[PDB]
Amino acid sequence: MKLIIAGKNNIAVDVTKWIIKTISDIELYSVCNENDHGNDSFQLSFKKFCIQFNIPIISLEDAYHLEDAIFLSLEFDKIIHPSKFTHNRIFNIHFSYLPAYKGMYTSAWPILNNEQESGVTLHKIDHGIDTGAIIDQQKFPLDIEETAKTLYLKYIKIGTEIVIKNLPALISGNYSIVEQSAIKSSYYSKKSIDYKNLMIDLNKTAHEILQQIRAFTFRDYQLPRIDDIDIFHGEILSSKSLSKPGTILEKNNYHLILSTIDYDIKLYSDNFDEILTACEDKSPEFISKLLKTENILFEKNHLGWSPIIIAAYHGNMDVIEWLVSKGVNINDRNYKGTTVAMYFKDYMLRSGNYTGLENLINLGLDLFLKDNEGLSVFDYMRKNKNIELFNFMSTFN
Amino acid sequence: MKLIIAGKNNIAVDVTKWIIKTISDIELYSVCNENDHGNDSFQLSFKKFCIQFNIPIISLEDAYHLEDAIFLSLEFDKIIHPSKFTHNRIFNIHFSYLPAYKGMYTSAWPILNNEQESGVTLHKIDHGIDTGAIIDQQKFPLDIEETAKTLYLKYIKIGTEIVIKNLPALISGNYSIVEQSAIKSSYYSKKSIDYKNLMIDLNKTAHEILQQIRAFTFRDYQLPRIDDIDIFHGEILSSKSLSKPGTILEKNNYHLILSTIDYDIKLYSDNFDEILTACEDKSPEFISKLLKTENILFEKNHLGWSPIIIAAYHGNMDVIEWLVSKGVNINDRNYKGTTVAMYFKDYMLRSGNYTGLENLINLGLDLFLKDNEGLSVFDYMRKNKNIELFNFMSTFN
Ligand SMILES: Cc1cn([C@H]2C[C@H](O)[C@@H](COP(=O)(O)OP(=O)(O)O[C@H]3O[C@H](C)[C@@H](O)[C@H](N)[C@H]3O)O2)c(=O)[nH]c1=O
Ligand SMILES: Cc1cn([C@H]2C[C@H](O)[C@@H](COP(=O)(O)OP(=O)(O)O[C@H]3O[C@H](C)[C@@H](O)[C@H](N)[C@H]3O)O2)c(=O)[nH]c1=O
Ligand SMILES: Cc1cn([C@H]2C[C@H](O)[C@@H](COP(=O)(O)OP(=O)(O)O[C@H]3O[C@H](C)[C@@H](O)[C@H](N)[C@H]3O)O2)c(=O)[nH]c1=O
Ligand SMILES: Cc1cn([C@H]2C[C@H](O)[C@@H](COP(=O)(O)OP(=O)(O)O[C@H]3O[C@H](C)[C@@H](O)[C@H](N)[C@H]3O)O2)c(=O)[nH]c1=O
Ligand SMILES: Nc1nc(=O)c2c([nH]1)NC[C@@H](CNc1ccc(C(=O)N[C@@H](CCC(=O)O)C(=O)O)cc1)N2C=O
Ligand SMILES: Nc1nc(=O)c2c([nH]1)NC[C@@H](CNc1ccc(C(=O)N[C@@H](CCC(=O)O)C(=O)O)cc1)N2C=O
Ligand SMILES: [Cl-]
Ligand SMILES: [Cl-]
Numbered sequence: 001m002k003l004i005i006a007g008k009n010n011i012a013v014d015v016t017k018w019i020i021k022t023i024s025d026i027e028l029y030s031v032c033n034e035n036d037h038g039n040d041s042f043q044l045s046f047k048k049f050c051i052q053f054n055i056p057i058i059s060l061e062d063a064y065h066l067e068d069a070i071f072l073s074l075e076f077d078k079i080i081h082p083s084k085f086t087h088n089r090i091f092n093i094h095f096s097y098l099p100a101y102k103g104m105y106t107s108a109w110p111i112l113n114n115e116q117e118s119g120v121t122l123h124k125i126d127h128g129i130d131t132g133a134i135i136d137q138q139k140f141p142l143d144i145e146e147t148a149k150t151l152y153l154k155y156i157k158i159g160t161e162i163v164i165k166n167l168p169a170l171i172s173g174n175y176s177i178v179e180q181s182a183i184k185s186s187y188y189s190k191k192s193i194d195y196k197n198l199m200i201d202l203n204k205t206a207h208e209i210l211q212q213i214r215a216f217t218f219r220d221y222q223l224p225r226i227d228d229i230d231i232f233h234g235e236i237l238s239s240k241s242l243s244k245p246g247t248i249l250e251k252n253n254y255h256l257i258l259s260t261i262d263y264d265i266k267l268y269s270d271n272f273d274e275i276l277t278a279c280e281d282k283s284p285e286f287i288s289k290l291l292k293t294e295n296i297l298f299e300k301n302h303l304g305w306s307p308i309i310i311a312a313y314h315g316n317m318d319v320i321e322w323l324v325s326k327g328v329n330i331n332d333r334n335y336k337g338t339t340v341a342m343y344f345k346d347y348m349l350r351s352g353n354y355t356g357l358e359n360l361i362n363l364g365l366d367l368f369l370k371d372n373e374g375l376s377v378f379d380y381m382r383k384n385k386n387i388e389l390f391n392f393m394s395t396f397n
Numbered sequence: 398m399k400l401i402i403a404g405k406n407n408i409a410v411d412v413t414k415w416i417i418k419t420i421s422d423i424e425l426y427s428v429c430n431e432n433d434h435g436n437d438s439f440q441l442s443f444k445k446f447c448i449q450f451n452i453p454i455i456s457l458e459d460a461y462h463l464e465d466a467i468f469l470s471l472e473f474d475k476i477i478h479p480s481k482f483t484h485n486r487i488f489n490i491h492f493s494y495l496p497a498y499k500g501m502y503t504s505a506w507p508i509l510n511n512e513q514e515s516g517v518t519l520h521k522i523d524h525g526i527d528t529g530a531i532i533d534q535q536k537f538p539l540d541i542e543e544t545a546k547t548l549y550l551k552y553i554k555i556g557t558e559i560v561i562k563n564l565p566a567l568i569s570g571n572y573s574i575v576e577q578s579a580i581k582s583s584y585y586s587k588k589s590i591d592y593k594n595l596m597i598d599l600n601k602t603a604h605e606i607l608q609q610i611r612a613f614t615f616r617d618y619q620l621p622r623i624d625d626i627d628i629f630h631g632e633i634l635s636s637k638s639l640s641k642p643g644t645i646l647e648k649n650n651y652h653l654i655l656s657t658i659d660y661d662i663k664l665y666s667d668n669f670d671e672i673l674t675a676c677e678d679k680s681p682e683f684i685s686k687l688l689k690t691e692n693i694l695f696e697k698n699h700l701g702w703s704p705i706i707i708a709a710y711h712g713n714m715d716v717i718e719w720l721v722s723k724g725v726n727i728n729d730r731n732y733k734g735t736t737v738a739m740y741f742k743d744y745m746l747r748s749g750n751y752t753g754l755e756n757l758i759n760l761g762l763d764l765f766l767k768d769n770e771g772l773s774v775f776d777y778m779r780k781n782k783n784i785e786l787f788n789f790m791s792t793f794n
């Protein structure tokens with residue numbers, strides 16, 4: 001029969017990849033979001049992917065006319081009315097644990113509201129906003145320093161997994177539904193947060209200001225900015241100024257210290273740029289003193305360069321190792337899927353210093369991954385006729 | 398030593414009454430709120446009470462100068478700075494379970510935020526807003542149809558009890574303190590709710606609209622008003638309009654039915670006036686059909702007249718009994734402390750029908766209570782020379 005995937009980002013791409021891999025006799029169609037103009041970013045363009053993989057792209061209007069189909073929305077942008085289809089085989093993933101957090105900005109509102117957990121829900125599409133009956137859902141805790149970005153990436157991951165787990169049952173029709181409860185049902189509109197005039201209310205407690213700071217931390221979109229300083233995390237102090245909330249107690253290149261309703265807060269200026277630059281050639285000790293939060297070690301720039309990617313490209317071995325010891329993925333990738341091993345290969349080639357590879361292989365470096373173009377490090381070295389290096393790399397298990 | 402009670406309402410009055418009763422060698426002073434102009438309302442005027450009981454009223458500025466004193470704030474309206482006293486014996490009751498819900502409108506915000514519980518906290522005054530170290534606190538659950546009024550009255554009650562329980566330890570100095578945690582500390586300002594332009598957001602779920610309706614239900618101040626109809630409670634329906642949230646599906650004299658993000662809602666128009674009038678002379682059956690929520694049976698007008706008070710004054714015996722069966726207090730009082738028994742005495746006198754008293758005594762009618770002037774039903778009948786009726790009433794245990 002036919003399966004129409006309507007949506008965006010790594011959820012739509014990874015679900016579709018799984019279907020291609022796993023489900024043979026299934027005719028795939030794509031419906032893409034209006035603002036998907038084919039550019040990969042922190043998330044892949046589903047439009048680009050579909051064009052490359054010969055998945056036909058159709059309009060939402062075309063989708064209404066397809067009979068013997070199942071329709072699955074994955075972060076789709078247009079309202080879907082069940083009355084416009086011949087069938088009821090119309091499914092959505094919504095990034096919350098429904099019935100809570102229907103609607104918008106689900107990576108922010110749970111954090112703003114100091115929730116202990118969130119989740120992802122697979123449900124039927126009905127006429128209204130995230131209102132249809134629940135087919136499956138999974139919960140997870142929010143971390144103490146969860147940000148909207150870290151939360152969104154959880155969503156992408158769990159939602160991909162829920163879709164894969166349930167898809168055979170969606171296809172067969174062998175699934176159960178439960179109507180959403182009215183109790184603890186909640187919704188937020190597009191008007192609920194104005195991302196283009198974002199204000200942190202400083203006439204609040206230390207905890208409430210830091211929850212806001214974190215709920216608004218999503219580098220690709222923005223960082224919170226206070227007193228003309230971009231902020232990347234902070235901490236609650238033990239001191240309690242008598243000054244009114246919002247008073248700036250201290251401002252320098254490193255941080256802002258503010259008085260609040262209760263405890264003073266220290267808000268760390270963003271120094272990610274300086275952290276990436278340090279990873280070229282500075283020691284772990286140097287970097288450990290530059291950073292004000294270890295969360296900065298996991299950040300990525302617009303290309304997806306992380307600290308480890310910089311350290312690998314530059315052959316900064318002590319930094320690579322130290323990053324791995326702080327829980328950084330030795331097989332990290334940029335936004336094109338290009339891996340640590342590929343960046344390190346370039347350093348090997350440029351430098352002629354092949355001595356560090358074994359160390360990294362022993363830390364779990366994977367030479368066999370492929371980038372978004374489907375090429376491994378081996379494919380590149382072959383294409384470029386770098387046979388000595390290809391052969392040296394090939395000796396490792 | 399000296400004890401200064403700074404504040405308002407039945408909490409300040411009842412605490413002070415307990416002290417007068419229980420603590421002999423204690424010199425009392427009062428500081429009253431700027432807007433306490435001596436008028437009893439749903440709460441007693443502490444100013445009136447102090448003048449009548451010869452408790453000297455002093456300014457806050459006078460209070461700073463009293464040495465060998467303890468200072469206790471009970472819903473006081475002016476900021477207290479610990480630096481202005483010779484001593485640290487400065488205590489506050491705050492109507493929340495701190496560190497949550499510092500600041501304003503604590504009868505509303507927990508309801509708006511769908512909390513499962515609230516509480517009351519006794520703590521030291523420090524320079525900031527409800528920030529000082531905790532001496533004691535008690536928690537309680539919020540009812541499913543809790544309103545800001547029912548919540549406030551809980552607060553008054555539990556806070557009076559916490560003060561009475563802890564006062565000897567405050568006086569002796571033999572109490573423990575714990576600093577408030579930063580975690581889960583929250584605050585709301587006067588700006589957080591505009592009671593003079595109160596808007597219910599109807600682009601929300603059924604549950605969220607009803608939480609707002611209830612958080613804004615406090616008859617003495619206001620009822621929520623939608624489409625020019627005063628609302629007193631409502632219910633979530635099983636129907637789900639396709640129309641956009643806020644669409645009025647039905648409007649008549651009884652109710653408004655609205656479409657929401659999820660389930661339709663029925664909002665009951667306020668008919669308290671009609672309920673009081675019915676209690677004069679109509680049957681329980683009649684009233685049971687007039688009411689749309691049994692919460693209406695417990696409501697009071699600006700004098701403190703409840704349904705039972707009306708039924709008693711009018712000798713509506715079946716209604717009195719039926720009210721008691723619905724959990725109404727047979728010893729209910731108006732805002733001057735005047736009891737059901739007093740109102741029923743007037744009906745006895747007016748009518749010459751003494752036959753129903755025994756029935757009420759058997760349901761728990763208390764002839765021995767005193768009003769805010771310190772007079773019982775017996776005192777009134779003696780003053781008015783109604784000796785036959787006095788003597789008839791006197792035969793009951
Ligand atoms: C637009 C925007 C978003 N964010 C955060 C908050 C948001 O939850 C997360 C992902 O943003 P996104 O996918 O635009 O939008 P959102 O989570 O509201 O998703 C909503 O719109 C999409 C198209 C619907 O399918 C979805 N079901 C909705 O929840 O990033 C920001 O931090 N800054 C922004 O400017
Ligand atoms: C991390 C890093 C990269 N570069 C260069 C090297 C790279 O070709 C160019 C753009 O980076 P990119 O978009 O992350 O590279 P891409 O995903 O196109 O991958 C390419 O370059 C890498 C180095 C090869 O191993 C890989 N086989 C190529 O496809 O920037 C730098 O100059 N400095 C750096 O720190
Ligand atoms: C003014 C106002 C209040 N309310 C509700 C909400 C509020 O929590 C409750 C009692 O009102 P109130 O005592 O004026 O004020 P509130 O609870 O903000 O108390 C605040 O101000 C007093 C003076 C401080 O001592 C206290 N600690 C504060 O919490 O009634 C309404 O429903 N409508 C109103 O217009
Ligand atoms: C409940 C009720 C009362 N009344 C009258 C009777 C009352 O004197 C007057 C004002 O009511 P109130 O302020 O509640 O009365 P108050 O607290 O001053 O008490 C007085 O009147 C009552 C009836 C006596 O038993 C009591 N001993 C008096 O002090 O209104 C009515 O006309 N209709 C009523 O339904
Ligand atoms: N029936 C249905 N319900 C949904 O919740 C839903 C779908 N379909 N399809 C995909 C996506 C679409 N979500 C939306 C949500 C709002 C608008 C919209 O145009 N809203 C108004 C009001 C804005 C607001 O309040 O957010 C607008 O003027 O923009 C469009 C698509 N979505 C589930 O993810
Ligand atoms: N140190 C101290 N802290 C308190 O929280 C407190 C006291 N004392 N004393 C009694 C009462 C007084 N509460 C208040 C709170 C705000 C304003 C005030 O004037 N606020 C500003 C801003 C308004 C707002 O944000 O609420 C104003 O302009 O009105 C006055 C008294 N109160 C605890 O109950
Ligand atoms: Cl190469
Ligand atoms: Cl009398």
Ligand SMILES: [K+]
Nearest residue numbers: 241243259260
């Ligand atoms: K402060």
Ligand SMILES: [K+]
Nearest residue numbers: 638640656657
């Ligand atoms: K609706």
Ligand code: NA
Nearest residue numbers: 039040041043
């Ligand atoms: Na993209």
Ligand code: NA
Nearest residue numbers: 135136176177
């Ligand atoms: Na199911």
Ligand code: NA
Nearest residue numbers: 190191193194
């Ligand atoms: Na917005």
Ligand code: NA
Nearest residue numbers: 195196197198
């Ligand atoms: Na702006």
Ligand code: NA
Nearest residue numbers: 288289291292
């Ligand atoms: Na550091």
Ligand code: NA
Nearest residue numbers: 436437438440
């Ligand atoms: Na009063």
Ligand code: NA
Nearest residue numbers: 532533573574
């Ligand atoms: Na204690």
Ligand code: NA
Nearest residue numbers: 587588590591
């Ligand atoms: Na206000």
Ligand code: NA
Nearest residue numbers: 592593594595
């Ligand atoms: Na108004």
Ligand code: NA
Nearest residue numbers: 685686688689
């Ligand atoms: Na009824």
